[PDB]
Design a protein around this nucleic acid. Structure first.
Lengths: 602, 87
RNA sequence: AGCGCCGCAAUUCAUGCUGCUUGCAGCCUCUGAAUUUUGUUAAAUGAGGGUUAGUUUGACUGUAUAAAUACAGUCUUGCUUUCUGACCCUGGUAGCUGCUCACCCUGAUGCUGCUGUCAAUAGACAGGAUAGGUGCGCUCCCAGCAAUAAGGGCGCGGAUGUACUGCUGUAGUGGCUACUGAAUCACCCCCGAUCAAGGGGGAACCCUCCAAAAGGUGGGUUGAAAGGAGAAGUCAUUUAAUAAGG
């Protein structure tokens, strides 16, 4: 996770900002909207959902006739390209989501079929429980990936004895068990799977990507319709209401510049770094950044100047800058939108390209990938692709003469396990795995140190700000706020503390748990309990454990994992994934998480 | 808000008879005045979601009343919506 | 009462300490863990709203070192956030507009709760985060109200074919728009900027140094942190409207 974003304000005189706003809002965003509409109507759309993959070129092909439609014709080539990238990534995202959800629904539907109680397994096997227990002992002795191997063994073995023995073996977590099945805990575990299947089935009714209408013409024409026309029935009037409540999108889609050299850097005579974008060189924007990021923007000019001095004998494949996003940030107050909103550039950089040693890491990664490509790839334009790839492979050998910082060296036998929990967001154990000894624990309080008071602040603000929103909603007041930025701050403080401890003990890796989807587990567990406690009373079921379900939906385990992954990559510490045990305290969970990831190395 | 003079003028103009103050025809005429003024407000005041809440109530109230009138008599219903200018 | 938080005290202990024998045995000062009490003249928490391109959290190079980092030199830009201080407020003037109310009972994640002049009715004026209850806080509790949660009761009028409606005022309480009031800050003041812009002048405390009873060069300092972002889908909570569900 070595890619990170740095940002700066872009400043320019009003006519440059107005011209860019009108390009984005009047042409580029309407084009994106049109591409999303046409792409969702394509005759292959239903087979793209089955593959879960979009064709590499279909957005580019749809955009070609639109580039000369009077609605969209006025744009530079890179703005059409940006619109293509926006639309292509949206569907690459959405088709990947739907594909995995469909696989989850199919997987659990098979499990629901093969989850049979011992009373059902007796009939469906025709064998006594001891007989299927012995047959499961044989099938386990052959399947010795074990879970998948049993799922593979189940499907084509139509022999109901072995098929039931696999069912019995899978019910217990791929192992034998002597103890009797508690019939109500089984019936609950069956009911959980039905709820999960239903909730997956409902999630697969997701909407197609909606776009951003900045005119909101549909709202005003619906208002005129609903006020002067009789609704033909309740369903038309409901559709009218649903439109009238829909909020207006203020801001256009950002521009995306996937060619780092489509940002051209310079220093003006007042000494400020400046940038202009390919196709819009007349609009000079001035960089206004914090000094904590200035060294990156200075590097972008130095990388640009280095390759010009070498007459392009360097490769921009090793430019520290990777891509840019050009974004309008919503301004407070009033004005024309190019005056109200603040133009902001977000630059992706790869942190390894800062140093010379890290650049050598990237160079070999580039060289191996391109040598693979050239070997596997072998038309005129496809031969031109090979020649560009071969030019890259030649030019990445030329050095940028970057700062030298020796790479981190961590001991392979020292690991940090990080236990994640709802009550204690992180707990760490430094384990010496060949010694099987814990070198150090730290609690959440020791990780946060002097910041530990922020953790009670978060809980207190989450309560307070929720209640103030609840009160504000009843007044239709816009003053609705929350603690997300404090929560993000805490997760970043924890990430830095964990990695600093890992560096201090020379740990080779940080071990993080494969939590899965905690929210759908908790939500289906609690619903199965509540349906027994409040039969036929839906509101009673939804009130049951409401605050626990809320707490689990706020638990930011993904954001914390992501923050740890970024900080570890910036110091070259390996991340490993392990299985967090359910037994024990957060300290013991962290220790056994660490040691299991060591033993799982094969 | 609606003045008593405009209110009583609506009553007099849509009355079935001089003491009718609450027939469905009078009710939809009252609501049509309110909906017209509030539509003009919301065209200018899109962020007035408090007032928008009222519109969705008022439109629904008139929708229920017109559906009630229409199955008492399509002659009275069609005449009424033509006077109010409702399509 | 209950619940959450805060510290306090106590027990046990290792992530703490002691030792030679480096893996074990003691201990509970420090630094922490396991939730066990308890609210005290205690020590900790503490939520009315707002105010800076604020300061510190940087980059490179050399030297040192066991990392951690540290010192010296050069450069520096203002982004997006989290705290701690300090300061300012309890707003004004016109428009537009929602919701609520015949009346009665119950009382909801309902509304209100500060100080002190005056003051029988009515609130005004001046203070002001000390803002009802407890260590602190809540949707809990207390007090008043409750039409603006749900329900229930029950008038006359219109309507009565399933829709419902009136009793409703210089009314109660929200929202939206325009203009407008204060802080618009990081040691203090003043004059400026706000798509760029900084300038001038002071107060404490410490270095540096005439050879000196005495003030005064050349500078320094005057709170800290964090960062990977965009785009699209989804879940959960709450609010509002609608429907009686193909």
């Amino acid at each position: 996770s070595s890619q990170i974003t740095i940002q700066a304000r872009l400043i320019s005189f009003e006519s440059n900002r107005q011209q860019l706003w009108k390009l984005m809002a009047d042409l580029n965003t309407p084009l994106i909207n049109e591409l999303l509409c046409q792409l969702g109507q394509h005759p292959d759309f239903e087979k793209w959902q089955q593959k879960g993959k979009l064709p590499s070129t279909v957005v580019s092909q749809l955009c070609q006739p639109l580039k000369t439609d009077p609605r969209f014709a006025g744009q530079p080539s890179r703005l059409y390209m940006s619109a293509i990238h926006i639309v292509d990534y949206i569907y690459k995202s959405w088709l990947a989501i739907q594909k995995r959800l469909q696989q989850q629904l199919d997987g659990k539907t098979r499990w629901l079929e093969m989850l049979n109680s011992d009373a059902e397994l007796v009939e469906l096997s025709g064998d006594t429980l001891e007989a299927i227990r012995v047959k499961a002992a044989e099938i386990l002795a052959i399947a010795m990936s074990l879970s998948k191997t049993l799922f593979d063994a189940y499907q084509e073995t139509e022999d109901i004895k072995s098929r039931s023995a696999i069912s019995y073996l899978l019910k217990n977590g791929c192992k034998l068990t002597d103890k009797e099945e508690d019939s109500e805990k089984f019936a609950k575990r069956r009911r959980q799977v039905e709820i999960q299947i239903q909730r997956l089935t409902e999630k697969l009714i997701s909407r197609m990507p909606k776009g951003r209408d900045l005119t909101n013409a549909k709202w005003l024409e619906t208002l005129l319709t609903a006020t002067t026309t009789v609704a033909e029935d309740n369903a038309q009037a409901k559709r009218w209401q649903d439109i009238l409540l829909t909020r207006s999108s203020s801001l256009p889609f950002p521009l995306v510049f996937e060619t780092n050299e489509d940002m051209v850097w310079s220093k003006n005579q007042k000494g400020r770094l400046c940038v202009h974008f390919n196709g819009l060189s007349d609009l000079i924007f001035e960089v206004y950044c914090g000094n904590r990021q200035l060294h990156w923007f200075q590097r972008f000019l130095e990388d640009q100047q280095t390759k010009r001095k070498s007459k392009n004998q360097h490769s921009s494949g090793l430019f520290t800058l990777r891509n840019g996003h050009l974004v309008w940030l919503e301004g407070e107050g009033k004005g024309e939108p190019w005056n109200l909103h603040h133009l902001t550039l977000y630059c992706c950089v790869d942190n390894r390209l800062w140093t010379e040693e890290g650049t050598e890491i990237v160079r070999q990664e580039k060289a191996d990938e391109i040598t693979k490509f050239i070997t596997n790839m072998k038309s005129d334009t496809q031969q031109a692709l090979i020649q560009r790839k071969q030019s890259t492979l030649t030019r990445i050998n030329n050095s940028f003469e970057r700062p030298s910082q020796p790479l981190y060296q961590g001991q392979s036998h020292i690991l940090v396990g990080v236990s994640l929990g709802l009550e204690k967001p992180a707990t760490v154990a430094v384990v010496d795995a060949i010694a099987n000894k814990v070198l150090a624990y730290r609690s959440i309080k020791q990780l946060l140190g002097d910041n530990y008071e922020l953790l009670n602040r978060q809980r207190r603000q989450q309560q307070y700000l929720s209640h103030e929103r609840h009160k504000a909603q009843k007044n239709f007041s816009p003053n609705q706020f929350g603690a997300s930025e404090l929560g993000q701050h805490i997760d970043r403080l924890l990430a830095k503390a964990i990695v600093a401890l890992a560096r201090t003990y020379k740990a080779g890796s940080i071990v993080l748990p494969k939590l899965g989807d905690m929210r759908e587990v908790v939500q289906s567990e609690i619903q199965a309990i509540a349906e027994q406690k409040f039969p036929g009373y839906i509101e009673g079921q939804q009130k049951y454990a409401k605050q626990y379900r809320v707490n689990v939906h706020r638990w930011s385990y993904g954001r914390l994992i992501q923050s740890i992954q970024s900080k570890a990559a910036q110091t070259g510490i390996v991340i490993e994934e392990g299985k967090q045990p359910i037994r024990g305290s957060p300290h013991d969970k962290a220790k056994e998480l660490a040691l299991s990831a060591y033993n799982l190395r094969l | 808000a609606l003045t008593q003079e405009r209110k009583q003028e609506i009553i007099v103009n849509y009355q079935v008879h001089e003491t009718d103050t609450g027939s469905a025809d009078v009710q939809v005429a009252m609501l049509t005045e309110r909906i017209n003024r509030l539509s003009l407000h919301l065209q200018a005041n899109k962020k007035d979601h408090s007032s928008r809440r009222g519109l969705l109530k008022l439109i629904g109230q008139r929708k229920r009343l017109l559906a009630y009138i229409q199955k008492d008599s399509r002659e009275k219903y069609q005449a009424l919506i033509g006077r109010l200018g409702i399509r």
